[PDB]
Structures are given as structure tokens and as C-alpha cells.
Subunit: 457 residues, 4 copies
């Protein structure tokens, strides 16, 4: 045994599983708004010897030795992080060790808040993320609602937009110490200035969780939250098209003749390590650095502009075929389809689209009373846009979706409960082959496009 054998030679069971997933991504129309296809260059850093190096601590302030090189990697990642978002290194710092997006947010709360201090975020069914403090009416779901006290703000169910007025009203009563400006399922731009005013009034930290829109922010195609946020967290594997990791951007420098300084850096860094995490995943840090360099290129601005145009085209196409969209349209990478005016819930549509190799997620529309069967779908452009999809290609995506919706509508006719629906898609021969025909035409269409990453895994 040498440890240098190939995965295909050493573990054919796993090696084929990798190939099965690669074929699945190659043949499908991937519309998960949070998914992307990472570049081979980044993946080469992700699966590297940097996995072997323990480097607990920070560059220049480590707890072991031998970190000479990974110090330069981590410092280079920090510089590329600030560069990609046009940040002055004298006003902004970045922590590049958060293992993912959820660890990034929990680090911020741990850094700035005491246990049971109060947090406000967009409610999860309203388009906010778990780590913005999600509690149900029965259970504390996210740990950000266990270790901290969270009250959500809601959408205006008339506009589909964030009710900044109701947020301002309830924030003066709840008195949060931090408010999260950031979403998982929101098609519109966020009024960060308005969020800033609310935070300045109730004396709260404004945290921007730009995970979904980070790539658009780096390409300067949408307004940047760094103009108004004290803290900015993001995922690196969404519109940033990198490995799965997280980042925490924080302000530095000046916040009666007294110079008020920012105190985020030391608290944030201490929260990530040693408070929350152990050894940094330097392979992930490096892979993120590779993608961050890609985010400064003119190529990436072209890419991000395409993501915008393909989501508007997807939205326009859906509107033209009789679909309503929450908030009426989109100004970013995703579309929130309201399927209630067509008679199919988002749960049925998600499964029937999945059987024809169209990958989306059910989504709650304003007014939904059921979570077993939400009334919408979330569709995202970033992944297929990385496969060099253009506006016409996304209009064909909408025409495949419309076929799936019709097949699902015909099955809800012939079925009762949700489980009868799902089993009917597999056991009824007529619809089983009708699905297989659409699946085949979906996969033939998607296979023709180029795919970032390795060829075979």
C-alpha cells in the first residue's frame, strides 16, 4: 500500500458513484438557486495535500509551526476576498476559515452577542435562512434560535417584498442587538440603507448575509451591501462558483474629539477559532482563493450579467405562459414561481420535475397555509448559466417545466393524497413512459452544454 493509487483502482464502488453523480449533473437542468458548478482549477486545490496541514490560529499568530505556506495561502485568500469585493484593506477585514455558511453566521453571533441576546431575520418561509434565527410555532429549529433569541420579520404579502415598515415598528419593541439583511429565497434587491437606518435607530449591528448574491455583488452587477453593513457573511459555493466554504467580512478602523474604533476583528476571529471551530480546512481556503481570483476577472462580470439576463428571461417566459411570480419578477439570479393559480402545489411539481431531470425546490408563497404542499417553486439561473446557457436556452427550460407541470396536473386529477401522487408517477405505466419521454428530451438538451470541472468526476 502506497496511498498513491487511483480512486478508480482502489475503490471502484465509490468511483462509479462519483461518475453517477457527474452524469446526473451533466444530464440534468439544475435549477437549485443555491447550486453551481465549481471549476476544475478550484477542485484541484480542494482535493490537495492542504488537507494534511493543521494550522489552528491565524497567519502570523499560529499555535504550531510548519504553516509557512498555508499562511501565504490564507493571506492570499484574504487579499483576493477584499479585492473581489472592492474593499479597502484599511476599512475591511475578512475571516476565511468558516467551514460553511451556517458556521459563518453562528460565528458572528457568538462574536458580537451574549447567549440569549436578540436576533432579527427574515422568516424562513418568507425567504430567510435557518441561521437567521428560525423558530416554528412549536420547536426551536436553528441553533441560532436556541443560543440566541430571535424574532422574524415578514414579507408584505401584497408586494412580496420585505416589509421594512413592519420591521422598523417591531424592532423598536423587540430591541434586537443584530439584524440580518440576507435571504435564501428572495427575487428582489434588499434596501440595505433602510436596514441600516433601522439598525442605527435601535442600536443594532447590521449583518448582511449575501450568500446567494455574492457573485453578483463581486461583479458589481447589483448594489453592494458593504456600503451599509457592519458585517458581511457569505457562502463561497453559490453565485461565487467556488468550493463549499464561508467568509466573514468585518469593518476595521474608525467607527467629542474621541476616535471611536471598530472592535469586530478580534471578536470575530476569536469566535471562529478557538471558540467554534478547530483546524481550518486549508484545501477549502485555497479552492475559495482560486474562485475569488476568478471573480475579479472580466469573464466573471460577463457571467454574472448573463445570470441576471437568464433569470429575467426565465421570469418573462413563465409570465408569458400563465404563471405568476412572487414580487412579480426578479432583479437577481432566481425566480419565485407561484403555482397556486395553476392548480399544482410546489411539492407535486418538484417531484414530477425531478423525475424528468429538472432539479428545483418547492417554495412557500405568501399566504401558504401548508408546508407539506407549498404553492411555489424556487428556480435559479447560476448553475446552468455556468454551462453557457443563454436567454433562449432558459426559455427552453421554461418549456420543459411547463410540460412537467401539465403532467403533474393530469396526475392530481387521477390521485388523492400526496403519496398517491408520488407513487402514481412510478407505478402507472402511461405516465411512467410519458415521464420517460420528457426526461429523455430534457437530458439530451442539457448534455450538449459544456460543464465546469473534471470530465469524469
Amino acid at each position: 500500500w502506497t496511498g498513491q493509487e487511483s480512486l478508480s483502482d482502489s475503490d471502484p464502488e465509490m468511483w462509479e458513484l462519483l461518475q453517477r453523480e457527474k452524469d446526473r449533473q451533466c444530464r440534468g437542468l439544475e435549477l437549485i438557486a443555491s447550486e453551481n458548478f465549481c471549476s476544475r482549477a478550484a477542485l484541484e486545490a480542494l482535493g490537495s495535500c492542504l488537507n494534511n496541514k493543521y494550522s489552528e490560529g491565524y497567519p502570523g499568530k499560529r499555535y504550531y509551526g510548519g504553516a509557512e505556506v498555508v499562511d501565504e495561502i490564507e493571506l492570499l485568500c484574504q487579499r483576493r476576498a477584499l479585492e473581489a469585493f472592492d474593499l479597502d484593506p484599511a476599512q475591511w477585514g475578512v475571516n476565511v476559515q468558516p467551514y460553511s455558511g451556517s458556521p459563518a453566521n453562528l460565528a458572528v453571533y457568538t462574536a458580537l452577542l451574549q447567549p440569549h441576546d436578540r436576533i432579527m431575520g427574515l422568516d424562513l418561509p418568507d425567504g430567510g435562512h435557518l441561521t437567521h434565527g428560525y423558530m416554528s410555532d412549536v420547536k426551536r429549529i436553528s441553533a441560532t434560535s436556541i443560543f440566541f433569541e430571535s424574532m422574524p420579520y415578514k414579507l408584505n404579502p401584497k408586494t412580496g417584498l420585505i416589509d421594512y415598515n413592519q420591521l422598523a415598528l417591531t424592532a423598536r419593541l423587540f430591541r434586537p442587538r443584530l439584524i440580518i439583511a440576507g435571504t435564501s429565497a428572495y427575487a428582489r434587491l434588499i434596501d440595505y440603507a433602510r436596514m441600516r437606518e433601522v439598525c442605527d435607530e435601535v442600536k443594532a449591528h447590521l449583518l448582511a448575509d449575501m450568500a446567494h448574491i455574492s457573485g453578483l455583488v463581486a461583479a458589481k452587477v447589483i448594489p453592494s451591501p458593504f456600503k451599509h453593513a457592519d458585517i458581511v457573511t457569505t457562502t463561497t459555493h453559490k453565485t461565487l462558483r467556488g468550493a463549499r466554504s464561508g467568509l466573514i467580512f468585518y469593518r476595521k478602523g474608525v467607527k467629542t474629539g474621541r476616535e471611536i474604533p471598530y472592535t469586530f476583528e478580534d471578536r470575530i476571529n476569536f469566535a471562529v477559532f478557538p471558540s467554534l471551530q478547530g483546524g481550518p480546512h486549508n484545501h477549502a481556503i485555497a479552492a475559495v482563493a482560486v474562485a475569488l481570483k476568478q471573480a475579479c476577472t472580466p469573464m466573471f462580470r460577463e457571467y454574472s450579467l448573463q445570470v441576471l439576463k437568464n433569470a429575467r428571461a426565465m421570469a418573462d417566459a413563465l409570465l408569458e405562459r400563465g404563471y405568476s411570480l412572487v414580487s412579480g419578477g426578479t432583479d437577481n439570479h432566481l425566480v419565485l414561481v407561484d403555482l397556486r393559480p395553476k392548480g399544482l402545489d410546489g411539492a407535486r411539481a418538484e417531484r414530477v420535475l425531478e423525475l424528468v431531470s429538472i432539479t428545483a425546490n418547492k417554495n412557500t408563497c405568501p399566504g401558504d397555509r401548508s408546508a407539506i404542499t407549498p404553492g411555489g417553486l424556487r428556480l435559479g439561473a447560476p448553475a446552468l448559466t455556468s454551462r453557457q446557457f443563454r436567454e433562449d436556452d432558459f426559455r427552453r427550460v421554461v418549456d420543459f417545466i411547463d410540460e412537467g407541470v401539465n403532467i403533474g396536473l393530469e396526475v392530481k386529477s387521477k390521485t388523492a393524497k400526496l403519496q398517491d401522487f408520488k407513487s402514481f408517477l412510478l407505478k402507472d405505466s402511461e405516465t411512467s413512459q410519458r415521464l420517460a419521454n420528457l426526461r429523455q428530451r430534457v437530458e439530451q438538451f442539457a448534455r450538449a452544454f459544456p460543464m465546469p470541472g473534471f470530465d469524469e468526476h
Copy 2:
């Protein structure tokens, strides 16, 4: 732009850094007890298209679709985890989604405890990990001491063993609901039967954090904590020689009535949706690769080797002029006490690093100082994976001995620790004396094979 360009072509600045780090691992003798050299097979899975897949939830209970393949990847990782530790799938389950070791432990506390519920672990300067509840006298350090109430248990300060009596005494006063039997810097073995007895009495959960010793347990080379522990957490790197990830093993099934075990649902819910978001499916897959390697006859011979190279390192260290904490290693690492040699554990680590031996300073029982601890932590697993054997490991000890002796000569001419390191780079007599060793250090280490890719 296609996204299929090579790293060397598209990002030469990063590619050179990768090559520089690979050269650093190839040329050095890696003695950090928590480090290992991951196999090429796992690394190819770590850097795979599985990074691209969001698969929030668990197999059969995910929240969107498209998880057809990663469901079987996660299930295969689960099966390989239970197989690797000889666990009956009806008595034990495993969560394979923890991002690392620290998240694995924090999920367990979240799953089983309420905020501010009480936990007991070995103190960090006594050899315990941060995530076992470490707070100092000045500051709450680990979040496991912020969100939960922690009191440490200590070593017998001249036996070098865990003071199991003092732990039993304080457990009835503190009344913890969970005690962690697991270490980061402990050369001997843990009495899991005794830990369970203490835990069974004060009615606390026994969790074993076998991160450092997980590989030795899987090879059935050391006693397994799964015989007495309710929950077991581990890292997938270290002695398991895998990607950076974490695992949570929990008991399952039946505990005048039938009381069932209720760990599974709580543990899984704590990992997702409570603490983490989307699983790192590439890490899960790479872990599955390494777990399969842990079932091999090869891995038992590998793990058996690590013990004897640590015992050989200990024996060799006892000679020359070193005493070692606990008097005798029984695992993969050695706790060497450098106080009976006039050199602190901090400066010895720095002098060894400039000569390409990477270790970590460690606090020995009685250390009156943390700026300058009195020991070093040395680990066998990394070099053993480079096919080092006992004769190869006795040479590192005297390669270290040249480093400890060379370091003593400069503390002669300097006072504080800043002056110490400063003289190592500016005095032409020692910079050459460092380089002279530095070549024979790298010349010796380069000759051994290295797991992973050749160039990155």
C-alpha cells in the same frame, strides 16, 4: 471560459503555493500527532463534483430532490463507518455530516443538552481539547463553555494519568449530564469502564471523543470505547488518514418495560437543521474512501506499526536525556517532558521547525508558564504512513536531539524569547548550523514514499 482549465494554467500563483506546500510535507518530518497524509483516492473524491450538490437533510428525508446519488454516497459512508468499527447496525448509528471534529462535539451537546447544562472534560493544559468545555481563569475560550456549563477534570500531577478518583468526587458535586472521555495530548489509555461507572452513578452521558485514536480503535489494536460509551465522536483525519470531517456515532435501539434509545433523532436534528446547512458531500465521499481503507488488513498492519514507532520513539527518547509524561506511551503519540533538559517546550518547537521538524509545544504537569510550556507533543501516524519503521523513528529522535542541543546553545547568548528566535535568523554562526542540519533533515525525509498526488 469553460471551468475545465487546469489549476497550473489558470492560477499559477496558487499552483506554486500548492507545490510549495507539497514540497514542505515531502521534505519535512511531520510529528504533529493530529496530522496525517491523505490517500490519493480520498483526495480525488474530496476535489470532485460532489462539491456542487446541495443535499440538505438525510437519505430518504431530504428537503429538495436530485439527491439520488448522494443518498447512496451517504448511506455507503454510514455502512463503512459502522463496518470500520465493528458496530452492529441495530445497536449503533452514525452521522457522517459534521464538518469537522469541533462541529461534531457541539452537535452532541446541542442534541442532548439544554443551554447551560453541565459538561465535564479533561482540562486543555491537562491534555483535553477545546471542545471539551475549556474556559481559562480569565475567559470562556471554547463555545462549549459559553453555551454550556463546563468544569474540567485534571490529571494526577505526577502520575501523568487522569485522576479518576478526583473526577468521581467532583462529578457528584457538579452533577454533569455529560462527560467527555477523550484527549488531544494524552499518551496512555482511557478507562472507559471507569468513566461509564462515574457516568452511570451521576446519571450522565458518556461521550468518547476518539478523534486522535480513531484509527487505532478501528484496527482493533487498542480497546474500543464503543463498549461503554453512549455516544462516540471523532475526526476522520488524524489516525483515520482521511479528509477533514467529523463523525458522530450514537447508540440505537432498546436501552418492567422496554425503554428505547432516543439519541438518533436528536443527534441528526442537531447536525441539521440546528447547527449545519448543506453537507459537504465531497468530504463525506472522501471519508467513505478512507473508512473502506480502515477495514483492510493493510490498515491494521499500519495502525500496529504506528504503535511500535511511538513505543520506539518513546524508548529512544527515554535514552539520550529525556523524561516523558506518564512514563510510557500506549498509543500514537509521546508526551516528552523537556524541563529536565534546561529547554522549554516553546523554544524547542521553534528550533525544530527551522530544521524541518514540525511539532507542538505542550504543557506538562507542573508547568508554571504557558508562554513557555515544558514539553512537546510528537506523533507517529504521519511518518508511519510514509513507511517509516522503528529504525527510521529512532533516527528522528536524535535528529530532534541535535535540534534540542542546538537550541540550548542560543539561549546561552539571548534572554527573552523574542531575542531567542531573532538570533536564529541573524547570527551567521547558527543560521549555518541550522542549514547544515536542515539539509540532512530534508535529505533523509525526501527518500520515503508519500501518499497523495505527486505535485499537489
Copy 3:
């Protein structure tokens, strides 16, 4: 030394101090809405040998012996408590050991909630009490906001009434586990049914803190909160005209064929003792029992009806002299005077009225921006009504208040900051004697009325 000497003989320094306070209560117009004059019968029980008896525990379940008699006293107090409020002993229980009102409320939270569970009450400047969870924008004030997480509900500043709509909206976001229906400075009746609906929706306990209105509730002159509340707490020294103590009323009995039982009794009793308190003050328990018996009499219903008529007469008189009142009037024992439309803040008016032996408290009106100088006063009828004040007498009280307001208006002319105002009342000879004349006419008028309690102390 025998321990049987008189206070006048053993401690003349204290004995005269007692007499000075008795003269002060006899000569003044006591308008503190929370104050009353306790009967001699109750005071005789208050200062009795029951002080000597430790009786930790409860009747029939004590931890020592010798409680044979105090068991009957405590049981008799419980029966008189239920009797006075027309409560079926099979549906209601009462704990009579809370040392005061604040201990009563903290016992309820401790009994029913975990630390950091959420609480909702009327904001303190809006008329709620500290123990309803009062936090400022800078500091946790009440311990009910330290050990539990509180969000306040506010008044509708247009009506002066509780904004039950905004309470319903914010309760669905905050998700409290207990809501407090009870006030310290509120002139109107509380919609307990509406509070009940809000609690039933968000699945919270409804606690009624009837402290100020308890006597009116016992006399059945205003609607009873026991028809809608799960828990009822009260002070015994306000409109109940008893010794200073507290009570916790809780439901008992029945809350798919399963009989759902109430679980308040054991938790409430355990919270009071041993969780929060030590030995019960049996002298206070007995004195409360004496006053509770008085609350069942036709005399007390006459008294409580008079308190209503004297507050309406006080309100009518103020309205006729150019004063506005928050919420426009009163349906209980107190009046909230808005002094902003007359140019005097409630802080100045309170001090100038105090120097002429009229005792009130400054009060915050809706829209007040300052707490140094609130814009109103809280005036209460219960105390003087116990001195056999009638409607005409309270119209004379208003005519004394109007003289004090005018004297204060003349001094704000001649002064600047608040401290200049207060010192001018003592150091300026012209106003000093002008005050002394009004004080004398106030005291001559009040001395003529009978006074409950002892003659000399």
C-alpha cells in the same frame, strides 16, 4: 427587660416618627392611586405574635410542627380569598404567601416559565408595571426582564387605550409563553376576552395582574378578570384596603375523550416556596384575611361604588377646569391627567402639590419624550374615599389641585431648569408663604375626615 414595654416608652425616637407619619396621612390629600388606609382590625393582626411563627410549607404539608393554628389562619385566608372573588373552590386555588405584588408575579413566571422564556406586558411608561418585564433602551430594569425575555405592548396614542390589534400582531411574531393583562396607570377597563383570544392563538398563559382594581373586582362593580384569566395575581394593600401582601389565584380541575387537567397549583405553590421565598409572614396573611372578610361585606361594595363615583367626579371636575385626561375619562379608581395643554409638566406639578400636602405621582402621557419631566399626573380615589370622601369632596380636591397648578405655572415663568423650580419653591419668600397658605387650607380640609386605623400610629 420584658419585651412587653410600649413603643412610646421603649423607643420615643421611633414612636414620634410613627406619629409624624400618622399626622402626615391625616392632614394630607392622599391621591396616590396605589395607596389606601388599612383598617385597625387588620393592623392588629399585622402587628401580632404571628410574626414569631415559622411555618415553611403549606397547610397539611408543613416541614415543622406547631403550625396547628397558622394552618387554620392560612386556610381561612384562602377560603376568604376565593369567597371575596366569587370563585368556586373546585375551579380555583389561591396562594396567600407572596410577600408583595412583585414577589407574586415573579413566582408565576418561575412556576410556569423556564429562564429566558418570553413575556409580554404593557410597557411601563404606557401604564404597565415593572414586574411585567420592563426594559429600557439601555438597561434591564426589572428582574422579570433579566430572568425572562420581555417584549412590551403599547397604548394606541390616539385613544389612550391598549392597542389590542398591535398586541395581536406582535404576539404572533414574538410568540410569548405568557402575557400580562394588568396595569399600574390605566384609567379604562381591560378587554380580558380579547387578551384571552390572543393568548389562545399564540398558545400563551394569560395572567391578570388586578392589583390596582382588585377591590373593585371583589365588589363586582367592574368586570372580573377571573372569567378569562388562567392566573390572577394581586396586591392586597391597594383597592383591597389590606396589609401589604400578594396573592396568586390559579385554576384547578379540567382545562379525544381525554380529560385535560390544570397543572398550575403544584407549580405555583412550589415556586413561592421553596423556590423563591422562605417562611411565610403569617401576620401579613392574617391581616389580609381580615381585609378579605371586609371585602365580602355590603359595606365594601358601597365603598367601591363610591371610589368609582369619586374618580368620575374628579375626572369631570378636571375636564370642566380645562384639563385633558388620557383616554378621555375613567372607568375605575384613577385618573390620568394630561398637563401638557396647560404648560406644566407632571414633575413640577407633583412637587408643588406635595408642598401643599397633596400627594400624587408624575405620569407619562402618550407622546412624552422626557422622563425627567413627564406631562401628566396619576390621581387616585381609593385612599380619600376610605376617609368617607364623597363626590363634592373630590371636586374640592380638584380645586386645591388647580391652585397648585397655577402656583407652579407662576414659578416656571420665573425659573429655568427643574432644579431652579424646586429650590424656588423653598427659597422665594413670596411663593413660600403663598404655598404655606394653600397647604394650610388643604390640611384643615383633610383633617376633618375620619381616618381608618389607630388614632395615634
Copy 4:
């Protein structure tokens, strides 16, 4: 209706109960160590018009007006409190508003600690009070263990003294920010100098809860905790012979710079507005009356008497056939161990109550049971205020001895504790044997003078 009618005329049902309770205290021998007979002067202030005055706030810093008189009442109570304990008003302050002892302690924790901060006290079965943080193995009992994290310190189970060594050992592990030196059932004296040393080391607040021994401290008859404690809490009844209330004494003033003491503002804010509402000015006044009595030469002779009647009770108890915990009382109470006499402390308390001797069962070191503890707590202060002396106190011991012996005879004919008490009321042989003693018990006690009113 005027409100000036007498209690006997207006409420005869209650008036008879009052007379019945006064007769019960007059006819019985009160041996509860925490009970006393309050003076008429204080009771007349307790039941005064001061009940009618709301005076939220503090003298000079109240929130409404009309507090002209009660300001001087509270200030006089403050001055009398500091005077009674020989405190310099520049080094010590006092809050006189705590409703009782339990609120006094809870205010201190609220003032100085954050929720879930750590506290250490003597365990309740070891002689500590609820408010020192008592939680059992099943339930959090006191709110001082709910809102704050408590670990108890224990006695040396055969020395009967506080295990100051084990307390020093656990304090460095638990790292409390406050330790309570104070007891409800402890016959010896507390090493406040040693408690401060432990507190000074682990950097914790030393609070002394002198409730039981406050009167002995004021008479300078026992060593005063104010020499080493940062904060001192007490009840105003018990040995202080006052109304039911509580006090919080705190250090004030100055603690290369000048660090001032910061207790005053926090303590006062915790009492009001954090925890309590309006002060019970009648209780404050009655307390002031009793505090003035504590400055008398009479009170030192009274407190000196209580010691010798407890020492006489202990000496007499050592005879007959009783062993007592800690071997020797040095305060106002005796911890008698009834296990070396075949009778449990629970049944002895009941048999003594039917013969008009009121005591409380108490757990002795080694008690394998709480349903039936192995001791009784007996206190001198109550009967000493009735001008009992050593000869009078040696007769109570053998009045008790008839009770302990009579109780042994019925456990003969019964099994469980329910059958025990049931036989005391239904068997004509023992009900007469109880009544025969019961008259000589009441006949003996009635002859002594009684503080307070004659009829209520």
C-alpha cells in the same frame, strides 16, 4: 364603617385564632432555632400606619413624593443597623428593604452576578439554606439554583465541620464568582478568614449569611463576619428578635491607582427596581426598633445567655443518652444525633409536637434517608427571651427525654410512619400518656414571661 373598629369586635373568628396562636406560643417550649418572640414595641410598629405608605425608591431618590417621614425612618433604620454591628458608615452600607431573608440573598446574586453565573454554598442536608443554591439530584429546588449555577460544598461526614479543604479544592475547578459562608443548621463557628482566603484565590465574592447568628454577632459575643466578608445578608428575626424582614450589608468606599467599591449601587438597584416593589415601611420601622434593642447592654446579656443555655442544653443532652453533631455547640442551637438512640429524627419531632415541644427534624452526616432524618434541630433564642436560664434549659432536655422515650414505645407496636402517628391519636394508652406529659409541659412553660402583647 370607619376602619377603627377593634379586631375582636369586627372579626371574632380571626381574633380567636390570634388568641389561640398566642396561647400556643405561651404554653409551649419553642425550640426552633430560627424562631423568637418579638417585642411589643416592634410589633406596635409592625402593625402601624406605615403599611399605608408607598415609598418606592430610596431616601432622597424616591419616584413620587410624600416620603418626608419614611425617609427618616429608613435612614434611622440604616444608622441603627450599622450601629448595631459596629460598622463605620464610610466602609459599610446597608439596604433595609428586603422583604425577608430569601429575597435578601436573591437580590445579592442579581446585583453582583449575571444569570447562570456560579455560586457555592453549604448543601441543604449539610446545614445550608435553600437560598444558598440548593438543587437535589432530581430537581432544582431553590430559584438560586435556577437563575444561577450552584455547586454545594459539604461537611466532613464524621468531623461535623465544614470540609474547608474540599471546598478549596472544588472552588478552583468550579470557579464560582460568589461563595456563601452561612448556615441554617450548623452548631459550630465558621472560619471567615479561611473562606475569604478561598474566595480571594478563586477571585470570588464572599457573602456571609448570618441570619441565624446575627444577634450573637451584634452583641460582639461571637466573631463578626464583617471582618472578612464583602457582603453580609441577614434576617431581622431569629436571634435579632425582630419583625420578619431582611438586610443586606455591603462594603463601601475605597477597595497604582484607587479602586473604589462598587457594591452599593448594584445592591440597591437589585432590591428596587429589579426585584421588589414598594418597601414594607412598617417592617422597616419594626426592624429599627429591634436594631436599637440590639445596641443595649441588655441584648449582650441576652445573647450571652442564649450561648450558655445552648451549651447547657448540649451538656445535658450529651448525658442521658444523646450524641450531638460536631461534638460541641458554639452558638445558639444544638445538632442532636438521634440515630444512637434507635429513634429517627422525624418521629421524634412529631412525638415532641404532641407534647408541646416544637422542633424540626434534621439530617445528620451519614443519614441514609430523608423521610426519616437522624437528628433534631433545637434552638435556645426563643425560650431565652422568656427569661429561661441554664437550670430551666436542663429541664427541657429531660422533658424531651420523656418524649423521645415515649416515642420509642409506640414504634414498638407500629411499622411505617403513618401507623406511628396514627397510634398516637387512637390508642387510649398513649393518648393519655401524651396528655399526662402535655399538662406538665404547658404548666412549666406558662410560668415564664412572654415578649409582645398579652392577648395577641
